[PDB]
Design a protein around this ligand. Sequence first.
Ligand SMILES: Cc1ccccc1-n1c(=O)c2c(C)c(C(=O)C3=C(O)CCCC3=O)ccc2n(C)c1=O
Ligand SMILES: Cc1ccccc1-n1c(=O)c2c(C)c(C(=O)C3=C(O)CCCC3=O)ccc2n(C)c1=O
Ligand SMILES: [Co+2]
Ligand SMILES: [Co+2]
Lengths: 380, 380
Amino acid sequence: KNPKSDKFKVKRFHHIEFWCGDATNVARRFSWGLGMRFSAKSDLSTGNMVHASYLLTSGDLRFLFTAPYSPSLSAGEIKPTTTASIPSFDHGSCRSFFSSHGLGVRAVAIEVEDAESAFSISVANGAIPSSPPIVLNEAVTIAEVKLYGDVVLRYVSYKAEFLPGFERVEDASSFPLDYGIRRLDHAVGNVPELGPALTYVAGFTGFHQFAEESGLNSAVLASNDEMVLLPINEPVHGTKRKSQIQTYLEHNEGAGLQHLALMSEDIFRTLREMRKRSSIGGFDFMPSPPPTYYQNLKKRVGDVLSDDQIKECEELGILVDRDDQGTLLQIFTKPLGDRPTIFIEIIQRVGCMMYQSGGCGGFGKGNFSELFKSIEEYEK
Amino acid sequence: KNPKSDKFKVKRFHHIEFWCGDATNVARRFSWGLGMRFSAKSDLSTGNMVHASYLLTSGDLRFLFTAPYSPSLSAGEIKPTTTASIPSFDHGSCRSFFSSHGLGVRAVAIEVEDAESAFSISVANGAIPSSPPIVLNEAVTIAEVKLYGDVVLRYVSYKAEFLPGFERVEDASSFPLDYGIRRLDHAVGNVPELGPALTYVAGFTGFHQFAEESGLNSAVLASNDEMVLLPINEPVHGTKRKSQIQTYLEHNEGAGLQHLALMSEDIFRTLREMRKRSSIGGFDFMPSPPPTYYQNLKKRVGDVLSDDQIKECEELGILVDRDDQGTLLQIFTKPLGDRPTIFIEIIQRVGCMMYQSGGCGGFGKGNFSELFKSIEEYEK
Ligand SMILES: Cc1ccccc1-n1c(=O)c2c(C)c(C(=O)C3=C(O)CCCC3=O)ccc2n(C)c1=O
Ligand SMILES: Cc1ccccc1-n1c(=O)c2c(C)c(C(=O)C3=C(O)CCCC3=O)ccc2n(C)c1=O
Ligand SMILES: [Co+2]
Ligand SMILES: [Co+2]
């Protein structure tokens, strides 16, 4: 049941912004490890004296990496005269964010029909304002409200090329890397208390709950067409293994974004390419499930995937789950930085043709059961 | 003339430590871009609740990347009970360093016969203490004194494997990258005033001055065998082009380390490998000199390098200079991070066989003249 209760017109995920200490090194690492191209920049060479911002793209996926310069470079500026291309940026907010949480997502950005209206309606419906609507070059409007912890939901709307004040990146500097990633599928928050978090976000967006010893309880909020998907987790305390949600909250100094799920047009090629690079600058993946997991794959998805497709899942450590309408292939990286906090999920969805409907196959909750069973069946 | 005035026994460069916001991402980028292997770690998985530290090695070159965790993880600790493997580390010093300078070198470390004595003698001779000698596992002694800005000179001495509390890195995580870099040749500071800087460092080390519109004046301090080489630059104001030393000081918020020079056993292979990776996560190089520069190469080094060796220099953008005892091949990267501050030099030295004596060929000062001449000769 989807009651289509969005309080403003939402289109799709637009971009994810990381706040960094050094945007250059994080962006180069991510570009190589994920196969994303350098597509736009805003930094000293473009006249921005406040922050360095580099955009990576793969298909529709946009990763933005931002870090502050010395405040002394812009000490004479005021907000009306700023050279920052992202006017919501603030030196002390960024340094405090990074000192508090380490490397992580500052903004989850979605494209809307009118960022000014989305903001007003959101705050009218309980959203805590973060940065008021600002019009850039009479061309783009951006506004921000608090989502959870120090993560903001950022509204972007266009009259009719990333943001004003960004330049396209030199063809020589932009190597056309591509491992198959095409768009952001969902973005997941960890909070101490799921209930108040759900009530707050659903309160100001109008997003509806999406049809659903693991360490957590979770729920998923969705836009009208269910293309914007925002799960939220809370810990479940006092168990055999310690809750990874609780571990996150401790090392992140509170609530924040837990994982980004990136849809691939070919998860087997994406994982082959990422795994080749794991030990030469890229990303590591979580430990592979036992062969018992893959022995049991035939009995549950043998109708969707061939024996060779299933054997390819075993080589790459891919996980498989399934809904009543579709099948999900997924895998998780190890944490992206120093702290055991944010990680990435690679996913591909099979089914729900109508175009493919959002959430087709779920989010892999059934893989908790199948992993536990397999990781006792393999013991013998 | 080398009066061998070292006030304690110095052996050679030991390691360079970068203070980072996220050690993981800087270290992975550097590993891929320079061809260095992951060799040791000290982090949560080794019991260190204070900082994450990752060591990269290539030959004798050791790059250490360190970033602080949340202070909350170690709030109950005191210095006697610390889990930090580098006891001179301090959360607030590290965050203040990085907020002030961005990514850069915190420590230039040299191996000495006794770090306790080196420290005492240094301070007895004017050095500003930074961290007193501390003995690790009755096996290694480390101490630190101020060098310039917020950069420290770190003394390390061993009784007879990087540091106690570091673990060797997993063979699966340690891919054997190698592009030919073998050791640190020199490490260069930028200061507002060269005179007082020279007097201060030479005062407490006993290092002697090494035989010597560019934007700078510079001088080089050397150990007894001249294997430890520490140039220092100051700006020269009011000129056609703005001093790059002055640009550094402005963007770095004061004095600090300007460049690290890494000796290659085969600079042509090193530069081929680094240049292949420039646009896929590695390092960019400064713009290549004009063909006039390379046309003039025959008349000055045609006796050292063949026509093919000189043509290979032109393909790779290598610079060549020469002393009275040796020849220097060198090239400079673009800045390593967001700010136009620290960069890397790749070098190879030809001559001065005795083993090769330090500084063989100089530091490339003559390449200022030859670059200016070439960059007017090419105009026509
Ligand atoms: C628990 C755990 C510990 C150490 C490494 C990995 C895991 N771990 C996961 O983190 C995990 C996740 C994060 C999802 C997932 O993507 C997800 C949810 O957890 C809630 C619904 C929305 C959503 O997107 C699904 C299955 C998972 N499974 C099966 C698993 O084992
Ligand atoms: C000035 C400048 C501007 C934009 C990019 C590059 C340059 N630039 C240099 O930075 C440069 C350096 C840094 C050295 C060098 O390694 C060095 C010194 O400058 C002082 C003595 C000790 C030492 O090691 C030598 C030649 C150089 N040359 C020729 C050059 O053009
Ligand atoms: Co997920
Ligand atoms: Co040099």
